[PDB]
Model the fold of this input.
Amino acid sequence: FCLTLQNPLRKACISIVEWKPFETIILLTIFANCVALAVYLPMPEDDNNSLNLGLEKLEYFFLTVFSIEAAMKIIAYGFLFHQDAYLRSGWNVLDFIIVFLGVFTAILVKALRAFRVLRPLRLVSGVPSLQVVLNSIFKAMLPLFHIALLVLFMVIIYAIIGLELFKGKMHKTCYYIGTDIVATVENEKPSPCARTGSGRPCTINGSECRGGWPGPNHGITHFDNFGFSMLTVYQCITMEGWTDVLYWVNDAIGNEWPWIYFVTLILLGSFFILNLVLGVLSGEFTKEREKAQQLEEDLRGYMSWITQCHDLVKSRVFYWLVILIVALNTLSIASEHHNQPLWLTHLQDIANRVLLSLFTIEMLLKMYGLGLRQYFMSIFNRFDCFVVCSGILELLLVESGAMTPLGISVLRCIRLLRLFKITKYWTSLSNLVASLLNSIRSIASLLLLLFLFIIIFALLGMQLFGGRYDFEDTEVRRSNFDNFPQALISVFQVLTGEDWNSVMYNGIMAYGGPSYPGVLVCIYFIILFVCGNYILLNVFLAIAVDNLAEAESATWFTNFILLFILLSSAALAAEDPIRAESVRNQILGYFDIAFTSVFTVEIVLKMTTYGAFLHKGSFCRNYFNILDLLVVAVSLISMGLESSTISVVKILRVLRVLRPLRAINRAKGLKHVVQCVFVAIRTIGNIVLVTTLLQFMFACIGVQLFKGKFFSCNDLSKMTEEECRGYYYVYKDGDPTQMELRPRQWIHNDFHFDNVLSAMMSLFTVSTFEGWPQLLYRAIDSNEEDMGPVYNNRVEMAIFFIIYIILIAFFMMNIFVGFVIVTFQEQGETEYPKNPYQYQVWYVVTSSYFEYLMFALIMLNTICLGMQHYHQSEEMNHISDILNVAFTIIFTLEMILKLLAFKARGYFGDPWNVFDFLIVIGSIIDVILSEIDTRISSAFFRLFRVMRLIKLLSRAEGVRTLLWTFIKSFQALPYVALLIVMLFFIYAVIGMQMFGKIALVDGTNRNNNFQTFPQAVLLLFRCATGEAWQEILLACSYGKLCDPESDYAPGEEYTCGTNFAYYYFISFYMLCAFLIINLFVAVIMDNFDYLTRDWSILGXXXXXXXXXXXXXXXXXXXXXXXXXXXXXXXXXXXXXX
Amino acid sequence: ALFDFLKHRFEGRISITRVTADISLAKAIIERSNTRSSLAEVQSEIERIFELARTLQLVVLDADTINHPAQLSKTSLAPIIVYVKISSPKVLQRLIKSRHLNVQMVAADKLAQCPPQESFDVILDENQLEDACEHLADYLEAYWKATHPPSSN
Ligand SMILES: [Ca+2]
Done:
């Protein structure tokens, strides 16, 4: 369309702009923007300023340049120019800058400075293909929208639910009373949620210290306003720190079932994020469903073919057979290094000079490899060097042929890198690894866009949070954007989803606490990882494609007895009986009574089962049984149960549950997913080996770089972990009038890198994405041997954690993809009347003009629920009563209206109506309960009043249907869930005594006690969530004294009552991991294996609309031609749609 | 290089020998070759093969004119043809250039046409000397096991 327009000089200047150079200029000056701003962030702290103070003009420089390009834009296409997206955003940013400094000139506030950070996107704006990338990412968001709302729906539904019971608890959380030693009773009148702390007391005063707040000291999380509940629901959805919400609420009445709420919430948020993964993978299958070098190799190899005293060495270029045998010998040489990489490393703090003469052996292996590279040099001279790998290995062996020089011990540490040469083996696996690395070339651009998002978000963050940064009292503050790298590590922090929470509660707390403008700051985090993790989720699809591209590439009488069906029936009654008995034994106290009859029962079942093994054994088993899983399972059932209680621990009663487990084999549905799993582990075992080898690599890295470190003192004020001795002040809060002595120092830092085994230890913890930044930070306090400190010493070390984490972002992410592909092939394997006045009222109601009306009524009820502020004092409460009365009357009235219809079918027919009837019932009942108020359960009834919202979902057509897909999906996978229970149900009991009697205290073991079985179910449930388990693990290595009221032991105490048992948690995380993997594949096969196809159909065909066409078919009969004529109108209408 | 491998490996067994006569020529005016390779000399070389094979030693001919397996089809010799494959003509282009190329292309493309299942017993498509020599050597060891049953001695 353009505007105004003019010839003359304008066309010439535009022709100049049609050239080339200007592009590079604008781009590079944008780069100048990026750099200058990245510096500009350093620092801030309100006023002061330093070097940036001159840059302050320079942004005006960029301004005027860009503005000159705007003068060029005048020559562009005006209104026609607006149509371009990149040009649109560019013009936008231009307006932000013009308005920016244009406001600034009058100033001769900080929001303008925030608007400064908009610039970097222009870097994308100048770059081709990134537009293709982002145009791709936008497409991804659509086939997800429903579920997002569903999340929001839960986020609302739970909120309103939280806006009841938890709002009823909002009456609790907002207040407290207490005194004396922090021993006030929990959850029994006059009780309250406590601040975390290593002690907790909260001076207020309120007698001797108060005792309960969490709306601000814990930060916002309080359920009072609907908004804050929406917040706490976000973080609880994040599967991060939420359990603290639980122990808080539970601290104050009570252990009823808050857990039902948090468990349903966790499990569902889980369910549907898994569904998100399903949507993404569905996009993968969508693109791939239609989507589904030898020449040069022949060239190089045949040139090598024609290519074919020193001449004896030329004979040695091919000779001889020994060169094969020598490879076996070579396996020894690297093996000597395989220990040496540890042996030169082991131990730590100068302990054990294991490399007493190992250096000579290193010189010897260096001599052998040098002899090999030398003979290879004799083999073909320069042609041997033509291959880069040969000269590389030769340069490595020569590097080992060097010397102790020099001062950079990391060069000595490169010997660990020399160990990589041992990875040369493993035939064909390297090719698969090449297939893996090949994907990186594809995903790298998107990774760069991720780097960009990281960049903009980081800078803006720096100019926001760190743009104030300051927070008087009282450490550790951790990362808080005080400097650009700091913001890097912290953005990357919350990006992991690790403990972002505390960051955020430094965030809102930074702006003077919650109010009205400051709380808005929260939005950033909500903008952030919710999109940021989303960006990560987006990354999956890339791999999802690339990886699939690779995929695209008179004994007879007893025989009558055991085989008898009646014997199996007595075995069935025995099954129900033994199950009832073991379930009776599920409580810890059951053994205290007469459990012996149950032992006789389990003995009978073990007898019949071992007899079944005896029956199968006589019929061509043995070696077949050695091959077959089942008969081997029964024979192993025979031998393992026979293991003595003496010598190596065992407990036969725990095996009593196992005897009926064989019946699970009779189910076939589990066998498909299971066969899929056994097919899966074989499919990607090499990757697992690669990961473990990475564990070795980073192990060797950390050990010969950190071993002297971490032997921390208290605090930094001691440095030398030997200079440490005696007491040490601790000032509570900040005031230098509240001293408390402590026999402090030293500290083992929980996870030494003194040992490569310990390296496997801690490195696994960071592998969990759980608790690492603490380890990171203290790693940054490192220096020399026995010393910590300080602040931000040795920042370069921080680079390392990230690097490894980045690799975790690869293969782990690959792992989950792998399963899916087999399943995708597995799915392919799976593919292999009315009358009188009633006639009048029915006509009026059936018209469903009321539908929009009733809908509006419901939404207004929603807003009435939004009214729920529990500040002070009354007035509005009575109004709320009146409102609830209003809606309940309107609704019950409406149900009466519907009652005035089919009646015999209106009371049922279509099921939701019945549900509505339920609603009316609970509504009226609760109302009467309100009348009787002139009682605690009435809250649980008001829940029913909240349940009305679901009716909105009833109106949510082409959305609830997806939930119906979830419903049809729901059944088949449930069989696995029993094992999902059983995996706990075993280990819990298996732990229930072992880790039992660990004493309640205040460690990681208080309201989170291991005591009764159900609580054990919880403490093993946290581990499922990746919720700070390692601390709990740390508690269990030696623990405390008994339950400090139990049988204890004797005079013995001294926390001696617990001992090493890392294996339990460690193994359990993995078992839980694999079991959950099974949960993935189960959900997938039972749903998206159909449901993704359902997305493909609903997005294109009309299989779903056809049901609506049948609904049109309802308004008819059953023939004949007259029915065809009456339906001809609706038919002629339908086909157009 | 191939005969070098076959010789140093199959030492004491293999009996490689050159054949100046064109054995493919071997099968009331008497037949006579118009070629310098007289048919009677060919008969003499065939008898030399009949004598050389009598010792039950391995034999690997180095015939010059036999560019294609089909030529030996009429022979009573029943040769063990070997096929040193180069599937890509461009590769052999660059090979011969790396040191008459066009007729070499028609010939190599011709040998590419042939049915591997019958026309050839072994395909030396391997690029490196080591693996290809391992294959052909394992093959000749297989034939060696085939021709020498334990009962014979
Ligand atoms: Ca976590």
User: Anything to note?
Assistant: Residues A 240, 497-498, 769-770, 1026 surround calcium ion (CB under 6 Å). The interface with chain A takes residues 1, 86-88, 90-92, 94-95, 98-99, 127-130 of chain B (CB under 8 Å). Strands of chain B lie at 82-83, 122-123. Helices of chain B lie at 2-9, 39-52, 89-98, 101-113, 116-119, 129-147.
